[PDB]
Enzyme design. Sequence first.
Site, short mmCIF file in Angstrom:
data_model
loop_
_atom_site.label_atom_id
_atom_site.label_comp_id
_atom_site.label_asym_id
_atom_site.label_seq_id
_atom_site.Cartn_x
_atom_site.Cartn_y
_atom_site.Cartn_z
CE1 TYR A 161 39.57 36.45 73.96
CE2 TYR A 161 38.63 35.78 76.20
CZ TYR A 161 39.86 36.15 75.24
OH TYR A 161 41.11 35.87 75.96
CD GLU B 155 40.01 35.08 69.90
OE1 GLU B 155 38.73 34.55 70.16
OE2 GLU B 155 41.05 34.35 69.95
CG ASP C 249 56.58 55.50 67.48
OD1 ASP C 249 55.66 55.81 68.02
OD2 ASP C 249 57.50 54.54 68.09
CB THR D 64 51.31 55.68 72.91
OG1 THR D 64 51.89 56.94 72.89
CG2 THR D 64 52.32 54.59 72.74
CE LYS E 159 54.79 57.76 75.17
NZ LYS E 159 53.93 56.61 74.53
NE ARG F 139 50.35 53.16 80.32
CZ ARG F 139 51.04 54.32 80.53
NH1 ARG F 139 50.85 55.36 81.17
NH2 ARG F 139 52.16 54.37 80.17
#
Lengths: 453, 452, 461, 453
Positions: free
Chosen positions: B54, B56, B209, B235, B238, B244
């Site tokens: 974790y 954050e 984008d 992303t 691609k 991903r």
Amino acid sequence: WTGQESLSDSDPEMWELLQREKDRQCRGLELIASENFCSRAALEALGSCLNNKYSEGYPGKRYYGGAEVVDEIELLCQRRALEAFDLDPAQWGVNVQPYSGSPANLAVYTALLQPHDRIMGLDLPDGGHLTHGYMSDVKRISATSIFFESMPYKLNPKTGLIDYNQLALTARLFRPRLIIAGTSAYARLIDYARMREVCDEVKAHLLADMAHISGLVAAKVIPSPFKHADIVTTTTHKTLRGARSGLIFYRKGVKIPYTFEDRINFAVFPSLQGGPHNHAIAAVAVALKQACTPMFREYSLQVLKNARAMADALLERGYSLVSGGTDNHLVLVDLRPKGLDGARAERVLELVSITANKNTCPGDRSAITPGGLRLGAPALTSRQFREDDFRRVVDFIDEGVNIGLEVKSKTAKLQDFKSFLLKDSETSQRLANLRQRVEQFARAFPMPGFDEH
Amino acid sequence: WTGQESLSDSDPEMWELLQREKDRQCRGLELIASENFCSRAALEALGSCLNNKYSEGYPGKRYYGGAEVVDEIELLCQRRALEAFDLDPAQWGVNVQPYSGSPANLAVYTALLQPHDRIMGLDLPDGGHLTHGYMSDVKRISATSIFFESMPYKLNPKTGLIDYNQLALTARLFRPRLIIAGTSAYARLIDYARMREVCDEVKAHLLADMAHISGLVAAKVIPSPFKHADIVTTTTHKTLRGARSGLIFYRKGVKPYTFEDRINFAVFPSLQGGPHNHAIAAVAVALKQACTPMFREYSLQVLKNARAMADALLERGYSLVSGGTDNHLVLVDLRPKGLDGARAERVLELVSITANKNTCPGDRSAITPGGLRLGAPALTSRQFREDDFRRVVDFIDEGVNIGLEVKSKTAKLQDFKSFLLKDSETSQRLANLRQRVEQFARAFPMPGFDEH
Amino acid sequence: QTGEANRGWTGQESLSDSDPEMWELLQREKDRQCRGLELIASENFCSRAALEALGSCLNNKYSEGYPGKRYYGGAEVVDEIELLCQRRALEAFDLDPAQWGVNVQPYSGSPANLAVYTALLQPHDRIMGLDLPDGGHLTHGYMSDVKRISATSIFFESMPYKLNPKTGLIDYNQLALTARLFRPRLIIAGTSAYARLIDYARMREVCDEVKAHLLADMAHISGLVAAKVIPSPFKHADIVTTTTHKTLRGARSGLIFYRKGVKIPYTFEDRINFAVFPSLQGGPHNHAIAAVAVALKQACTPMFREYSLQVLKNARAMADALLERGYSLVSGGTDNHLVLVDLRPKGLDGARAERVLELVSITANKNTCPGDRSAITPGGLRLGAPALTSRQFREDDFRRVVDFIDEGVNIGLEVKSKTAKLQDFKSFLLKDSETSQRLANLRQRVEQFARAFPMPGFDEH
Amino acid sequence: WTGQESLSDSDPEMWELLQREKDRQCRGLELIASENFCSRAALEALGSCLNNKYSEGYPGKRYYGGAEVVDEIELLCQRRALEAFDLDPAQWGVNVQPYSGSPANLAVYTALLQPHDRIMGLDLPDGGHLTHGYMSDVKRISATSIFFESMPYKLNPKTGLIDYNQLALTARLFRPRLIIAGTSAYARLIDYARMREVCDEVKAHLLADMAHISGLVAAKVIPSPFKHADIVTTTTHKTLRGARSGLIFYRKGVKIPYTFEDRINFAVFPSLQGGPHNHAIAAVAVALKQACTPMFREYSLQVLKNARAMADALLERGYSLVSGGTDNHLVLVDLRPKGLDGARAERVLELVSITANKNTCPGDRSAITPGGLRLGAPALTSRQFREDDFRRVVDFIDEGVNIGLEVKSKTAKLQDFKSFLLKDSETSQRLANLRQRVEQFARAFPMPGFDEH
Ligand SMILES: Cc1ncc(COP(=O)(O)O)c(CNCC(=O)O)c1O
Ligand SMILES: Cc1ncc(COP(=O)(O)O)c(CNCC(=O)O)c1O
Ligand SMILES: Cc1ncc(COP(=O)(O)O)c(CNCC(=O)O)c1O
Ligand SMILES: Cc1ncc(COP(=O)(O)O)c(CNCC(=O)O)c1O
């Protein structure tokens, strides 16, 4: 170029970082209540060719072809999810696509509420989660307080328990459409039956966010929110010991029928998310299978026993516990009695390879210097720690607190304290000797996952 | 129990499923323009102990301790993302935490806009993405149309190109606070300079984008949106050929820009929880690959392969929306040929050729697309060259001709699809073509692990 | 062709000649007002002088904008009128124009409040007001458990505060507690049905703590405040709204007062003026502004203070006479112009009681009381002194009013003993001859008493 | 004190102001297109004991008792509203409580639209009204652009007519829930059939805001919007010649019924307004009965003739008219072919007792100096002006324009022009001479209402 080369040969810089992180995990006492050590088997699925597949939509109702196998995988994950929580498939369904816990909660609100509709959750400083609608006096912090209108509920500060009486009183006035029963830092069991009574009174949906306790619920070592909640969200990476992901469970069938399923699924996709992460879905299905076994029930029992043993060892050493104790996987230490705040203690402990987090306590006056620490047992229980070992953990914590108490005696501010731990050679020697003993003890226990990364 | 057991021993059911998906990938002609085959190296980082941590917050400003190493990893990913796009840190920053593309765009809107502020993007039927604000005549679909107020812009149906003139006209009326330049299904280069002109006139933020074209931009084989955009999202799975995930790039320094703090705050604490450090690391692995001469050659080959596939379809009497391609994909209009994209996609799927249906400007039924979207990135990653893509097109044409025979024998779409499965004569011809397609495809190399 | 067929239209004809149907209706309404015991606490009887300005050529003038800042010319006279109204508004409330301004254009009370919200808040910002069953007004944010009712709960996010059921007073302690949780941007201090004085100092404390604006909606008490017979909200609020037609005894309109000048300056003025126009309203109603100015000058006089002191005395006399006859009062008494009666112990609800009273020419309104188990059958009545005080009623006259009310209450108790549902009760009042004759006799006696008193306004309309 | 004293005795200051305003109205040429002179009979109802009655709710459905007579008045007003517009009460209803035009339109939006739902109206500089959704490039101006999401439609700048083609195009993209057909400054008839076609295509409600033209519609001198819109708003104080107020008309009955009536009535009260203004309702009812008469049809015919006479006289003097002419009660003069902007012209005319308003023209580049003036015929037609009298009006206007030109040639900035008119002795003498002739002419005509107030 093949793309079949190994990480160690093709990117030595990143391979070394992965090894360094693994060594940190193995040599430390990891007490962060939301952490765990995922199995190698789940990680093998997470790092697989499933990453490559676009499959927007749901099984049998995809936008693209080629989904024959990911359909079977997603449906298997749903079935293992319902099985893990002892749910009748005719009364419950599950969405396995949320990318994490926070996406899961946002999808629930988006499914069931209009923008600016009202939600109530436990306040962040009182142990609730950001996504339960957190904003402060001075700005809107969680998106769940921007797109929706939140009002917190509170602990009774004298007892450390959720004040169910004040929650009922204020929900009658605020008229929430949804109330969230679930916590990030609370050591007691939630009165879900009372939460449901409030929700039925004010005509709100009851969402249980069981992220922290999900594996305990699956293991049937504590009461299940599913007996009283309409919707249940969770992460898969906490007490469930899976890869990082989320789930949303919802009632389906006869209440007149339930109407969550279509709205929940639509909110996740197409409203909020894009293509699912099939590699994460697969890894989650692996961990959910593990959570169905007797091995996992014994693990979960040892988690509770270990948290209790940690609590008792702290009480024996003159610490105080918010709510006086624990009934779950974590303990909320109040250090102000000992004369050391959680920000200081947290830093000293980090430097001896004990990872905990500072935590606000009832009555605290400043956020920079909260009174407490949150300590959890799940991760180390997954390394086969038992009660005696958690007593040794507390022995080491107490040494570190004692170090912090001496530096506090020689320092003014939080920043002076912190550099002193590094500058003063007499302080850094005691830290080094404690760290060595801590790491010798922790290094001796087994660790789930791959050997080196 | 150790949690060190292999998946193959501890979960046979799931193991055989992973192997089945790997087999499917290896035997298919995978023409979904958004897909790629991720390297073993990145996948090794993706399935690592980084899952466990974790963290954050942001490097050097975390909520918790123990973050020495993940800090180094996150900062290295940021450095590698800027390097892949030839970006100066003094002008650009990056957020490497978005869980995917859709989370990345929603964070940009949350960071820069108030609820119900106005955005304009390319309409979904015309080639834009859901997260560019899509709603239909019938209801609101994307959350980007629920929490914000969207109005689409359109193609010129006679040219197949973005109608920049009408975008300028409608933007003056609608007054958007942000305009999105970027597409899911568009075969031409976007005029980012013109988009910038519109945004400057109406005082809107320009978001590029670049998800589909990200690998081509990093490789410098097409022009870069960073020359003109305020914010760029993408992303990583691609044309960048990674795991991903998502990325948000933003201007900083003197214009001072005020994007950085708002963007980072929106991702965390506003929208997301703990980062997925295994994903960040895997992305960093792919970004380093993207800076190499190897990746520029790969990207040049993607362009040549898309062009070769376009030229072959034209030679066989297919029509192409906008008449050709300047990027990694081709938009085929099957309407003249007498077959629609819904029918064609399914026949092709049954012979192990994966594409997706695509709306065409010439469509007369908003419900049944007239086209297909075909992409070169995935098969180019298996060393396909121009001649191999010509052979791909001949297989497509064999499938289209089967579809035409079945159309002559059936009425509705569902009738068409069921006939493909259950008519014995049809299923035999499909089986023959499928075997030839698969044995062709299986002979090429495949990135990733050997068996999963 | 002769007579009216040989006469062209001038638009100078009298209503009584040109529209006999409407003329008969206006006279019938005047007769209703003169023969009734009008106890609706929000009503009053406007002076002839104000009505003469209300029905004037000022109706004909478009004057969008503000004095000296109009969209159209020809505004020299309406500018002087609007400025005069502003000055008389500030004078009536003892306000220094260097510290306070006023907007005199709101068309009524509800438009005035909506303009304050639109000026100071963004859509969906939070407000807190006294809940409607507890004595608040619709425009303080009312919504029910089943739907959003006021536009102030649609365009803004409201949460009510409440009475302490056991004292009948505003529960300031709970308001402080809940304000901390809800974080309102604006809290409204003001009531439609409350018999006690509001602790504006405490309300300002709460608002200062949670960084909210304090709005005082003094509609009901505005004339009492102007006359200095009760404490002024202007000592603690920086925004104050009101109607002009209740205790101020003017034409139907609204006002918004706001602090201005040095607070570093206040920044209310431009926002409130902009909200009223151009945001919400169009052309002012200059005839109403003028009528309001007439009533505001009246409110500055010794006569009006004597009126307001008599309003208080009459309300207290009504309260005392009710208590002597065994009635219960919510909060046990009154410090203002109204009384809240709890009929539940007498065995009769406010729906039944208001209808009996209506049929004997006594107009009051049913009122929810703390602990009511059902709103179709609220427990009480709201009874007001301003209207009859304007007709020179004194304390003994209000004792006589209570005698008549008690007779009506007794008829209702008898009818309740003979009928089941509220619908059967109401039909029985009309169809039972014994009851109908008893109501007619009481009506005759009520009307002969009321008609003898003077009445402000024109003689017959 | 009785409250029965006359205004003249009890408040001499106010009485003198009322007389001064009356004198101003009598001595001027009032060309503001939205103004008229209300009848004495209506004013007598407006200034009546009806002011005193609280009657929240609707006839027979009130909150409080004592409403027998106000019920009868409100129902009479409704019947007279329907009658004035030739409406079958089984197919149409009407709400007579809106306090003015702007309240009427806001109530329609609140009844039929959720907050932030989309509206389209004619842009303010192109002839629309603030309450059709106006916002500028820099600020949200009308509340109808704050609580709802507006986008304007435009004139065709070549023709000066509403561009119905572009409205259709942009409505398909913007997807309004409601489109407003109605204007504050437009000299042509609206194509309600085309507006309805567009609304039916995109599934929007068509609202006709007929405020300016309502009296012309009631007199049947121009086509009625009620043939093509199922919701219609209006004021009662423009061409209908009544007291200031508003009305909302809506279809009712079988459309499966219409659902306008209950939503509209609820939006007006309890949502938006409080107690109705019964004095205003009554005054409106008086004016509506007048509007049903042959007298009023002759008045409305004369309004059309007078506007056309004014337009013709301006053209013959070389002025241009936006859209090339008029079909209604007003004329949009373009002063650019004379070389004097509307800001300058409006002020000149004001100082010679001719009230008009500056009006933006197609092609204008500065709002501070728009190109034109809006001139209306209703008010002076109510004073028995005929065509020749409007020709005299245009003669006086042209003299004023010529003075404006002379001052323009001696001054620089708008502020210097305005001060010259007051401070230049020669200009002040010329204005005074023109003013006396204007006033001598205007005073000779009769005036509706009271004698002196
Ligand atoms: C332009 C664009 N932006 C964002 C996304 C969202 O990415 P995620 O699926 O990870 O949320 C996509 C996905 N488009 C997938 C396709 O074209 O097939 C996209 O094409
Ligand atoms: C109750 C609860 N709900 C949701 C989340 C969010 O999950 P993601 O971080 O995957 O978004 C958390 C994480 N809580 C982290 C902690 O307590 O340390 C949580 O505690
Ligand atoms: C406190 C308060 N505020 C505003 C209003 C609204 O004024 P308009 O009705 O003019 O909108 C009222 C009216 N209340 C009427 C009553 O108590 O009977 C009120 O009591
Ligand atoms: C079309 C239209 N609609 C509504 C209104 C609003 O009426 P109120 O001012 O009563 O709110 C106007 C006023 N327009 C006045 C003018 O054109 O000069 C209008 O022209």
